[PDB]
Amino acid sequence: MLVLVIGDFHVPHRSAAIPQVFLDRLNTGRIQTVLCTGNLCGKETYDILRTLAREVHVVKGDFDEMQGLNETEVIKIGNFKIGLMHGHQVIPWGDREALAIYQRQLDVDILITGHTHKLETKEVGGKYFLNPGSATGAYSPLVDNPVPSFMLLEINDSELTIYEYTLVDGSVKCERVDFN
Length: 180
Ligand SMILES: [Zn+2]
Ligand SMILES: [Zn+2]
Prior knowledge:
- By secondary structure, the protein is mostly beta strands.
- Helices cover 13% and strands 33% of the residues.
- The chain has one domain: Metallo-dependent phosphatases (Purple Acid Phosphatase, chain A, domain 2), CATH 3.60.21.10.
- The chain is built from three helices and eleven strands, in the order E-H-E-H-E-E-E-H-E-E-E-E-E-E.
- The site of one zinc ion has 6 residues, from loops.
- One zinc ion binds at residues 8, 39, 114-115, 117, 138, 140.
- It is classed as protein transport.
């Protein structure tokens, strides 16, 4: 059960494009579902991930402009419950305790966050925190030299493996972690 985690590739009124290294590798990857943190470029992007997975899971962020969306959602893949949201509501942004209380509040095992534009996967009390980072290296007050990034995760029941993909200076890097 291998799912794509990505998002956060736009900000209000700023230029960005879509790498086809991620697409060309992910187009054939045989991904059943997709987990998105949000801030889509628009209707031109939210279908690209329908070429990737038949089921796409989207939520709202600071500069989302579509309709028919929820700002939070919870998912059960394998034996893993995971909570999806953008994190633009979490104040302060990226604070270690706020994510924790949100994670006891949502009764998830894993909480995806966005809006920091970094990859940052930190595990605590058996709880996993995954941030896709800026999928196209979008500009944020947090980062001015950002890298495009995303994360794939295969959940075989209780065993979960993560793949940290970063397009660093023309080189594609994968940093894989094995969890059980
Ligand atoms: Zn963002
Ligand atoms: Zn954002």
